[PDB]
């Protein structure tokens, strides 16, 4: 394949003509929401859950999506067909729109953009990644806003310090999530622990919590103190692109020998199970 | 007049052709900085101070402005001349640019946009405005990021509650600033008080602090507890558009009779003094 079209406000447009006027509130004021999901075998994965979150995020910024969910789903499928692709990354963006005063939102601009399935998608490396803690709390964390400035600004420091990612700790006390991932601990008794509050409710997080409970693991959704890293055997990320990704080091702590923990490897397999089961309903 | 041109990346472009490709990081990730200043008698006001802040904000997001300050100043003057206007609002935007991966910043896109001088600019109403307190702390507050989502999202609640603005209170404890203004108290002994930390260092704030000290007022730059509203005689905003704007009510508290306090009215006159003195050096 090669990506020929995006969709702006219900119209398929060649990628090279896909533009917004500079008065768009995303450009001037960072006012917008988005979602991102993969397609496999021609089907966006868990699509109803992603679209439900997109409509919920939009409601929290008082931005009306111009199409109902069934019509949005049609445009997404139509865009897969127009690009002639079965495997893809799909972005949805809803901006504050072409504001008259550079502040008051009006009709949003809706973007559907499409890319190759990321090469790294569900790599499931046996080698855990290395991350740093960073004291920070995302704004409006339950809403998928376009606001990624702390995450992006931290790229230089992350790379400088020999890490590939970070875990946000609210006031250096409470473990939350990374800029683009949910965060989980596995304790020595095999209890899975993940933040309940002041985080984005990831679609991957949902599927992994459900799979873990179906397998008979105890999954605690609660606040996690920074000191509880020392009680954990395993640490992992969930996200649309990562699936389940082993974390082998946080700051000066190696999780086991740095390689993927047993419950993490099991959750990887069960995640792939959830994906296969989804694609069987399509 | 009528505005004919903006400037994108050093090129004058008709306003109707001023667009960014949808891959721009401001659109996808809210990654960018900006500045906004007025021009009078053909001269952007306090321009060196605004441009210094623009370069400082850019450095904090690791975004390189493609032009040095003298060249940027030339483009701004050239754009005033091309639009044939002496009175204007001028926006500068520096985005994270056309990122290959929808996350890593590259060469920024630089926008210079121009509008009529706001009709409300320095209205200096004798009637104080009505504002609400809102518990919130801006991200990277010393940097003028494009991230205005809390401020914009609050518009509905502000208007619903019969207010026209808000004052952010960090953890409902520490008075900071509004979404677009610095915040000052005047005490009964005529001491002026304003936040020192975790706020944007406004150009208007600077000029008003300097003018107050020149007049022999005590100006304390310190943390302000929410309970100190009850010790204050006067409250006002500073911003590029407002100049000095009387606040007549915060929540259930009327400042005096709701009309502009004596020190606030004096600071308005001294602000206009600073403006006239600036325009005499041009
Ligand atoms: C703050 C935050 N927390 C968790 C997730 C994981 O959610 P899910 O399992 O539903 O993917 C994401 C995902 N971002 N995805 C993303 C962000 C930027 C660019 C590309 C993708 C996120 O932004
Ligand atoms: C957070 C914050 N705090 C203070 C000021 C006042 O700074 P100055 O006296 O230098 O104007 C501004 C100004 N925004 N200006 C602005 C924002 C959005 C749209 C238009 C103008 C601000 O954003």
Residue with tokens 């376009």: A146
Q: How far apart are CA B239 and CA B167, in angstroms?
A: 13
Shortest-distance ligand to the CA of residue B35:
2
Instruction: Please name the method used to determine this structure.
Output: X-ray
Give the count of alpha carbons within 13 A of A65, CB side only: 24
Contacts of A271 (CB under 8 A, 6+ apart): A122, A204, A207, A208, A211, A238, A243, A244
Q: Do A27 and B25 touch (CB under 8 A)?
A: no
Q: Could you count the other beta carbons within 10 Å of the beta carbon of residue A119?
A: 6
B66, B110 contact by CB (below 8 A): yes
Minimal Cβ distance to A146: which of B8, B29, B91: B29
Say if residue B259 carries a ligand binding annotation.
yes
CA of A120 to the centre of ligand 1 (A): 15
DSSP annotation of B102 reads S
Spacing of C-alpha B105 from chain mean position: 25
Say if residue A157 carries a ligand binding annotation.
no
Domain A5-115: which topology? D-amino Acid Aminotransferase; Chain A, domain 1 (3.30.470)
B232-242 as b/e: b if 16+ CB within 10 A: bbbbbbbbbbb
For residue A149, the chain B residues in CB contact (below 8 A) are 29-31, 61, 139-140, 145, 147
Say if residue A175 carries a ligand binding annotation.
no
For the CA of B102, the closest atom of ligand 1 is 19
Residue A231 DSSP SS3: helix
Q: How far apart are CA B156 and CA B233, in angstroms?
A: 29
Q: Where in chain A is the domain with CATH 3.30.470.10?
A: 5-115
Query: What resolution in Å is listed for this PDB structure?
Result: 2.0
CA of A83 to the centre of ligand 1 (A): 24
CB-ligand 1 contact for A75 (6 Å cutoff): no
Say if residue B27 carries a ligand binding annotation.
yes
CATH architecture of B129-280: Alpha-Beta Barrel (3.20)
For the CA of B240, the closest atom of ligand 2 is 11
Which residues share a beta bridge with A194? A184, A221
Q: How far apart are CA A134 and CA A171, in angstroms?
A: 9
Q: Where in chain A is the domain with CATH 3.20.10.10?
A: 129-280
Q: How far apart are CA B5 and CA B247, in angstroms?
A: 37
Rounded to a whole number of angstroms, the distance from the CA of A218 to the nearest CA of chain B is: 34
Which residues share a beta bridge with B105? none
CB-ligand 2 contact for B207 (6 Å cutoff): no
* Dihedral sign from CA coordinates of B135, B138, B142, B146: negative
Output the residue whose Cα is nearest ligand 1's atom 13.
Answer: A180
For residue B142, the chain A residues in CB contact (below 8 A) are none
- Pure H helices in chain B: 25-29, 47-60, 69-83, 149-153, 155-160, 203-214, 262-280
Output the residue whose Cα is nearest ligand 1's atom 2.
Answer: A180
Output the CA–CA distances (angstroms, integers) from residue A79 to A211, B105, B262, in the order listed: 31, 27, 63
């Amino acid at each position: 394949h090669m990506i020929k079209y995006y969709n702006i406000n219900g119209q398929q447009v060649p990628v090279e003509n896909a533009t917004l006027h500079v008065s768009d509130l995303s450009i001037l004021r960072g006012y917008g929401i988005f979602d991102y999901f993969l397609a496999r075998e021609g089907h966006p994965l868990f699509l109803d859950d992603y679209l439900n979150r997109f409509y919920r995020s939009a409601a929290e910024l008082y931005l009306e999506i111009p199409f109902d969910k069934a019509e949005l789903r049609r445009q997404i499928y139509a865009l897969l067909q127009a690009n002639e692709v079965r495997e893809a990354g799909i972005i949805l963006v809803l901006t504050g729109g072409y504001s008259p005063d550079g502040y008051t939102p009006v009709n949003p601009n809706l973007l559907i953009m499409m890319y190759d399935l990321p090469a790294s998608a569900w790599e499931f490396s046996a080698q855990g990644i290395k991350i740093i803690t960073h004291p920070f709390q995302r704004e409006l964390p339950e809403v998928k806003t376009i606001n990624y400035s702390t995450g992006i600004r931290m790229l230089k420091t992350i790379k400088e310090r020999g890490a590939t990612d970070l875990i946000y700790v609210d006031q250096g006390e409470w473990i939350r999530e990374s800029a683009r991932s949910n965060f989980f601990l596995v304790m020595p008794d095999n209890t899975i622990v993940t933040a309940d509050e002041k985080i984005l409710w990831g679609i991957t997080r949902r599927q992994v919590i459900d799979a873990a409970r179906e397998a008979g693991y105890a999954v605690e959704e609660r606040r996690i103190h920074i000191t509880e890293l020392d009680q954990a055997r395993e640490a992992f990320f969930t996200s649309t692109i990562k699936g389940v990704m082993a974390i082998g080091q946080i700051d000066d702590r190696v999780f086991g020998d740095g390689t993927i923990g047993k419950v993490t490897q099991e959750l990887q397999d069960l995640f792939v199970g959830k994906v296969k089961a989804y694609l069987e309903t399509c």
